[PDB]
Enzyme design. Structure first.
Site, PDB file in Angstrom:
ATOM      1  CE  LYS A 141     -28.693   5.422  92.070  1.00 54.96           C
ATOM      2  NZ  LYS A 141     -28.791   4.326  93.120  1.00 54.96           N
ATOM      3  CG  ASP A 163     -29.459   1.311  93.548  1.00 57.31           C
ATOM      4  OD1 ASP A 163     -29.416   1.830  92.416  1.00 57.31           O
ATOM      5  OD2 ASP A 163     -29.503   1.947  94.605  1.00 57.31           O
ATOM      6  CG  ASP A 168     -21.001   3.430  79.609  1.00 61.68           C
ATOM      7  OD1 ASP A 168     -20.819   4.058  78.534  1.00 61.68           O
ATOM      8  OD2 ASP A 168     -20.039   3.130  80.358  1.00 61.68           O
TER       9      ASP A 168
END
Ligand SMILES: O=c1[nH]c(=O)n([C@@H]2O[C@H](COP(=O)(O)O)[C@@H](O)[C@H]2O)c(=O)[nH]1
Ligand SMILES: O=c1[nH]c(=O)n([C@@H]2O[C@H](COP(=O)(O)O)[C@@H](O)[C@H]2O)c(=O)[nH]1
Ligand code: PRO
Ligand code: PRO
EC number: 2.4.2.10
Lengths: 257, 257
Positions: A92, A90, A95
């Site tokens: 995330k 996880d 960018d």
């Protein structure tokens, strides 16, 4: 009209990671993802071993492990293979594509080397997916897109959620589904995983909000519940996982009819 | 009406991290942040040492360093202190508050122990800030909120950007400014840092889009340019950094009048 997990695993446009997941969910009668939010590798591995049979997936945050090594992930893979669950890091990603490519493949964590699944925020635009796919597609991995969040004040709503869905449906070679609080795509080849889940009502002091397995699987149409503290803070984590598994599995069965 | 960086450093509501940054920007005549997007610690430290005098800030992605250790960050701090620049770890926290707290303080990276600044996406709601602040406020750190992104298809626009600004203005004890492509807050105590910067027009193949220092500092009103490849891919990185510094600094001076 709703297909079982086992049938969804055979859909023509299914991604191989999703098909593998759906098949083991059906075989094991589990749609529970354990959010193994612990800081010690020994606790991560003891949870994975004991709860492996009860889960379809183990979600890691490896950047909170105090004692991360690549060997810990090797031991975790051994358990995922033994007990048949997928590993979801996880991370995330959130960018520009050129950066996330390196964050996924490289660094200390070498995430792409051990994670079956990762997730990404869609706020940067589709370059986030394209960048991750440059690494993940050759490694036969899949990605989940964050279409909604469970926390108070989430901006992942409305047109943002719809952008996430479109981005997934346009990158189906790599995107296998969503983190969401409900069904957001009508296409059954896409998985829906829902965090912010507990059997009792409540939240935490930092904006988490909980809904029940019956609500998120039954009424809201999601496939998999992601549970952290409701399991990991309990004394008997195995019995807690079994409680969450039975809740999410019955809710799924009752939805199919 | 626009105050100089040196004057902004003295504003009543200035955060101490911002004041320190503004004072060294004024002293060194630099509003350039080097995005040190490299995989080798030796290259990170050689860039920091040679370009230290030309920069106000060095932005890291420590999760792409192949050879990260806490000792590398100790050496980087020595250079930041020597040359007077702040260290910004571009981690893009983007989770629920309870998770980011641990990601900031803990794990292998112990980010809060060496980063003057970090950044966060606002999509989870204000719990992301509250969680980071629980660690960062005791450690006298600051946070930047991502109000816009430079990449194609960015969803950080419109009401999302306005939510970021409001979240910053409500957490000014910890939030010192924004990552944005332009001035988004009218309050001069908040910094604006702008990536997607190059002297020439163009982009990359994964959705990055570039604008010039004169455009982002002059016309769009941002304070600091964040430059990666325009410096780090050049043969002479020091001369490149000086070119970017002079561009961003003149643009700032011409804006003040
Ligand atoms: O919207 C989201 N909400 C959410 O909580 N999570 C994550 O899922 C887990 C929830 O943990 P518990 O609150 O159940 O203990 C934590 O690891 C969070 O980081 C997530 O990924 N997305
Ligand atoms: O909107 C944003 N755009 C952006 O490029 N960055 C980041 O800033 C740097 C830009 O690098 P270059 O394209 O100049 O080589 C990279 O490290 C990105 O991760 C960022 O943080 N936010
Ligand atoms: O999983 C199975 O065995 C069956 C085959 C068709 C769909 N489900
Ligand atoms: O930096 C300085 O020295 C002056 C003091 C007031 C504002 N600027």
């Amino acid at each position: 009209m709703e297909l079982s997990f086992g049938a969804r695993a055979e859909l023509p446009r299914i991604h191989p990671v999703a098909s593998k997941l759906l098949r083991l969910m059906q075989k094991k009668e589990t749609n529970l993802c354990l959010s193994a939010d612990v800081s010690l590798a020994r606790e991560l591995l003891q949870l994975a071993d004991a709860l492996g049979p009860s889960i379809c997936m183990l979600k890691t945050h490896v950047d909170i492990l105090n004692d991360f090594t690549l060997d810990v992930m090797k031991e975790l893979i051994t358990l995922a293979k033994c007990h048949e669950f997928l590993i979801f890091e996880d991370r995330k990603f959130a960018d520009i594509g050129n950066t996330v490519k390196k964050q996924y493949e490289g660094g200390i964590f070498k995430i792409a080397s051990w994670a079956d699944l990762v997730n990404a925020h869609v706020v940067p635009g589709s370059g986030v997916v394209k960048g991750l796919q440059e690494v993940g597609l050759p490694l036969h991995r899949g990605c989940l897109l964050i279409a909604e969040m469970s926390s108070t004040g989430s901006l992942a709503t409305g047109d943002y959620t719809r952008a996430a869905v479109r981005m997934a449906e346009e990158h189906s070679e790599f995107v296998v589904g969503f983190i969401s609080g409900s069904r957001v795509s009508m296409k059954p080849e896409f998985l829906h995983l829902t965090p912010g889940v507990q059997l009792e009502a409540g939240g935490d002091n930092l904006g988490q909000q909980y809904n029940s397995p019956q609500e998120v699987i039954g009424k809201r149409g999601s496939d998999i519940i992601i549970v952290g503290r409701g399991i990991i803070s309990a004394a008997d984590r195995l019995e807690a996982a079994e409680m969450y598994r039975k809740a999410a599995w019955e809710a799924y069965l009752s939805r199919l009819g």
